[PDB]
């Protein structure tokens, strides 16, 4: 009765997890196909994060940034090896991270001209809750109550190579996307679109920003979503699975848009040793040799059965995605909220989201049986829906 | 050499921490009296926030708000109970809470008119990095490259009734203030001026907003500064100390300021398990009977030796503080900058600040006789200054 009433919630309160279960106080077990939302990469409890964290908090968990640690040091050599090789910046959440890509590309823009402050972003896009993020997030409805926000802002609609050209002006610093939209409803952007975002911002002179917050850290069958498409942007966000439970983000960039300068942005708990430990872990996992090869393997395995149920389904409309995030979206007669529902009663936990979907966001450590186990469920409930 | 360029930097790796004292690697001790930046309260690897940390690790760390959990429950019965009883919301971070604090303050202000947008803060003031909690902090330097940022602020010059009455109008939504400035150099309100804030908010019906970010969870002697000077606000946020070393942060509202509903406003990471387990922690060792007592006896004894310092030493223009919290001041031919690096070179680690400060933050648990060997070093660099 103590917390402010700003979220939806399943009536369940969980303390304790091992895999891809998770249970509440008298022991039901659910599986858990949310990941905390897409988070929990290694799905809950995993032997190694756990002794990494154990470890950790019996020597140091935090120091500031007025010195250096060691495992902040080694997480941004792995994140700069692992990807295009540039520096990294530490924050503490996806909207965090954001927020310093967005200064990133305000700095860079005034190296040229003080009008080059327009940043665009896509209608429908979810880059955080923070006023500069939220400004970036191209969803009215979040804002509204909020205004006047971040001036400078201009949307575009997803995968619309015109929409984009008629919206660039030399005066654009960055162009903000996610690969594969998340809170939309899980929507992958065609290569070509991307391809077309990287020209215009070398024509333009302009940051191209991916947010991988949600598709980044070997969701898609890849490290980073980035790497499946062939696309590579100046400046990359991450969070959520980068610390497979422990709070934490980042930002990378590569020599163009290394403009930071001592004093230009800062942040207190950003980088401490026990979350970067974390991170340690969860890479090292990640690229472990055959893990990510088994993720694509069974992200293909859960496609195939929801793409099959999708023509045997008269309900569901379409199902989209990657690896691992992937969406399934009803027709319009059918509540995507009531389908999460009656999952839930049936202990399965999916993440609704936007157009009338629901979100299959299984840790990458999923088993086949458990694939099997969460698509019967839905074929369940959508069998009496 | 993987990580971006924006922090200055003492010249030490740390791997290791013991109460008021943390190791490089060769095993070099310093007596800490940084705190991390006024984070570690317990100091560090405290047995019961270690204890309760790998507890917590090996049972749940993260699992979304989609969902309860007990640790945040908790957490935020305790923060009402133990503050002016109001509702929680809990952000990772320092400018996070400050950003949700905005946007309760907006959506607040919109219940009576849609130019009911402005804040106010103060000249000097910090509340944090992201674009929001920048608008905020009253520093151009700070903003300037990141322009423009958002509209509807205007700062007044702390402890200055006359300014801050000026600048009040019906088209305020909240003023924020630190009840003591950190990041400035350490500048505690005057209680007149905080009574005049209180005043004039309910005048104007405004949101008053206390950051507490760095001046609170036990630091002056009490839990929050503003039961010190008996001035309760709104709004009260929280970050640093409250998780002892996990990052989390806070945001308390009275039942006025409790305006935000589902979807309003949310965060992925946000009152997690984990993080919530280490405040309980925290909030039940501050509690503890006599625990802040001795912290105002220890900050009376610091703040005796540090007065006595002032008048034996023309160097040091003034000491000002409260509890555990407290800035000296040089004469403006020595560089605050300079003596933080002696005090470096002889293991004493201080926080320099503004206004040619350096700031004394031991953890709350720091020992009498740790407080003598940081005066005498602290005497032994400005004997040679
Ligand atoms: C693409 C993307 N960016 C940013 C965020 C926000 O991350 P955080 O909640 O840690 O601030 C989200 C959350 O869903 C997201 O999907
Ligand atoms: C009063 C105050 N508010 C907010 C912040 C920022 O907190 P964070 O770095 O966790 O975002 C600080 C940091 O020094 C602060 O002193
Ligand atoms: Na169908
Ligand atoms: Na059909
Ligand atoms: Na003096
Ligand atoms: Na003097």
Redesign the interface.
Same mark, same amino acid.
């Given at each position: 009765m103590?917390?402010?009433? @700003?979220?939806?919630?399943?009536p369940? @309160?969980?303390?304790? %997890?091992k895999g891809s279960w998770?249970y509440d106080e008298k022991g039901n077990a659910y599986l858990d196909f @949310?990941s905390?939302?897409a *988070?929990?990469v290694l799905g809950?409890?995993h032997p190694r994060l *756990?002794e990494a964290?154990?470890d950790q908090?019996?020597?140091?968990?935090?120091?500031?940034?007025?010195?250096?640690?060691?495992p902040?040091?080694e997480l941004?050599?792995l994140?700069?090896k692992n990807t295009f090789g540039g520096? !990294?910046?530490?924050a503490?959440?996806?909207?965090?991270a954001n927020?310093a890509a967005?200064?990133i590309a305000?700095?860079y823009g005034?190296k040229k001209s003080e009008k080059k402050?327009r940043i665009l972003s896509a209608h429908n896009s979810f880059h955080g809750?923070?006023?500069?993020?939220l400004?970036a997030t191209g969803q009215p409805?979040?804002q509204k109550?909020?205004?006047?926000? *971040?001036? %400078?802002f201009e949307y575009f609609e997803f995968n619309n190579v015109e929409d984009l050209r008629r919206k660039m002006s030399e005066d654009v610093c960055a162009v903000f996307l996610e690969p594969i939209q998340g809170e939309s409803g899980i929507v992958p952007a065609t290569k070509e679109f991307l391809e077309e975002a990287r020209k215009l911002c070398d024509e333009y002179d302009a940051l191209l920003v991916f947010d991988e917050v949600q598709c980044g850290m070997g969701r898609t069958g890849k490290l980073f979503a980035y790497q499946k498409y062939g696309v590579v942007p100046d400046v990359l966000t991450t969070?959520?699975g980068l610390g497979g439970? !422990?709070?934490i983000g980042a930002?990378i *960039?590569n020599e163009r848009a290394?403009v930071?300068?001592?004093?230009?942005?800062? @942040?207190?708990?950003g980088?401490?040793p026990?979350?970067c430990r974390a991170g340690v872990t969860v890479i090292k996992e990640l690229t472990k040799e055959g893990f990510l090869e088994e993720v694509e393997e069974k992200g293909n395995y859960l496609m195939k059965k929801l793409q099959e149920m999708k023509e045997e389904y008269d309900v569901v409309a379409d199902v989209r995605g990657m690896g691992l995030m992937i969406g399934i979206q009803f027709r319009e007669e059918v509540s995507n909220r009531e389908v999460a529902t009656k999952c839930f009663e049936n202990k399965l936990?999916v !993440?609704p989201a936007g157009n009338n979907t629901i979100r299959f966001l299984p840790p990458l450590t999923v088993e086949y049986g458990e694939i099997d186990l969460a698509v019967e469920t839905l074929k369940k409930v959508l069998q009496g829906i």
């Open positions: 103590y917390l402010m009433n @700003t979220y939806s919630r399943f369940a @309160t969980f303390v304790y %997890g998770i @949310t905390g939302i *988070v929990n809950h409890s *756990v964290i154990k908090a019996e020597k140091l968990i935090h120091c500031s940034n007025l010195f250096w640690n060691r902040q040091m941004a050599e994140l700069s520096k !990294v910046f530490f503490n959440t996806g909207t965090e927020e967005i200064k305000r700095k005034k402050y809750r923070t006023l500069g993020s400004t409805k979040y109550p909020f205004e006047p926000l *971040v001036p %400078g969070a959520k439970g !422990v709070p930002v *960039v290394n930071l300068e001592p004093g230009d942005h800062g @942040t207190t708990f980088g401490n026990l979350a936990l !993440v």
